[PDB]
Amino acid sequence: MEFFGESWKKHLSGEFGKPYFIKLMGFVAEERKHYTVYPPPHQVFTWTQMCDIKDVKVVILGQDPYHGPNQAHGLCFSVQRPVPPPPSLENIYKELSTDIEDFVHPGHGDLSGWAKQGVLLLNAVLTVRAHQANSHKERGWEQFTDAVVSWLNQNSNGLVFLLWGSYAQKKGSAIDRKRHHVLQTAHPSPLSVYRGFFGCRHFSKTNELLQKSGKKPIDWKEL
Ligand SMILES: O=C(O)C1=CC(=C(c2ccc(O)c(C(=O)O)c2)c2ccc(O)c(C(=O)O)c2)C=CC1=O
C-alpha cells in the first residue's frame, strides 16, 4: 500500500490480505471518519521509509504512538520539529549525555537521523485516537508488528534489541538470543526511569555489540 517502503513491502505485504489486517484497516478508516487519529495516514509507516529492511541493525520496541497534536509521526519516541521532546525522550537524551562521548542535545526530538542508520523505532500499536492513549490497542496492530519482529528474528543476524519496560520485554520475549542481542531495562518514562534506565548505558553497549559482529556502529549524535 501507499507510503510503505519497497523492501519492507516485499517481505510484509503477505500480511495485508489476511483477514485480521483487512479488519484492522476498516477499523482505523472508520475511526478517522469521526476522530482525529495520530499519526496522519502518510506517517503511519514512516519506520519503513528510513532504511532498507536488511539494513536494520538496532530495534527499539515501543507501545502506543504519542496522542497529542503534532507529536507522533511513525517512529517511536520521536517528535518532528518544532515539537519539544516529551519526557520519555528527554530522559533518553539525558542517558545519552552520560553514555556517549560529547553527545549534544539538539533541542528537537526528531530521531530520523537514527532511523536512517538502521535503528528501527517500532511501536507495537501504530495508530491512536487523539488524546486517548491505548485507544487502538488489541485491534490488529499487535499481530502485525509481531510479524515484523518475527521476520527480523528469523531473517536478520546479530540485531540488537533494546527492550525498555514490561510491554517491550514481552513483545521481544521470543527473540533468539543466540542469533541476536537483547538488552533489557526499565522504561525511560519519568514513572520508571529511575528503576534501571538511568545508568543502563544501552547505547554504548549497542555499538560495542555491533562492532564485535563486524558492523558499523550507530552515531547516536547524528540527529
Ligand atoms: O508524554 C507524552 O506526551 C506521551 C507519552 C506517551 C507514552 C508513550 C508510550 C509508548 C510509546 O511508544 C511512546 C512513544 O512512542 O514515544 C510514548 C508514555 C508516557 C508515560 C509512560 O509512563 C508510559 C509508559 O509507562 O508506558 C508511556 C504516550 C503519549 C503521550 O502523549
> Where in the chain are the domains?
1-223
**Cell matching residue 144:** 502485525
The closest alpha carbon to 118, from 206, 208, 183, 44, belongs to 206
Could you count the other beta carbons within 10 Å of the beta carbon of residue 206? 23
What is the largest distance, in Å, between two alpha-carbon atoms of the chain?
51
**Separation CA 207–CA 199 (nearest Å):** 16
In short, whether 66's Cβ falls inside 6 Å of ligand 1 is yes
**Separation CA 75–CA 56 (nearest Å):** 14
Number of helices and strands (H, E) in the chain?
7, 6
**Cell matching residue 91:** 530522559
The closest alpha carbon to 42, from 5, 97, 77, belongs to 5
What lies within 8 Å, CB to CB, of 161 at 6+ separation is 58, 59, 61, 172, 175, 180, 181, 182, 183
Resolution in units of Å:
1.8
Tell me, in angstroms, the distance from the centre of ligand 1 to residue 65's CA. 7
In short, whether 136's Cβ falls inside 6 Å of ligand 1 is no
Q: Dump strand ranges (E) for the chain.
A: 37-38, 58-62, 119-123, 128-129, 160-164, 181-185
Residue nearest to atom 29 of ligand 1 (CA): 66
Tell me, in angstroms, the distance from the centre of ligand 1 to residue 63's CA. 8
In short, whether 68's Cβ falls inside 6 Å of ligand 1 is yes
The closest alpha carbon to 8, from 157, 120, 173, 158, belongs to 120
**Cell matching residue 212:** 564485535
Pocket test of ligand 1: the residue of 63, 90, 120, 121 to mutate, having most ligand atoms within 8 Å of its CB, is 63
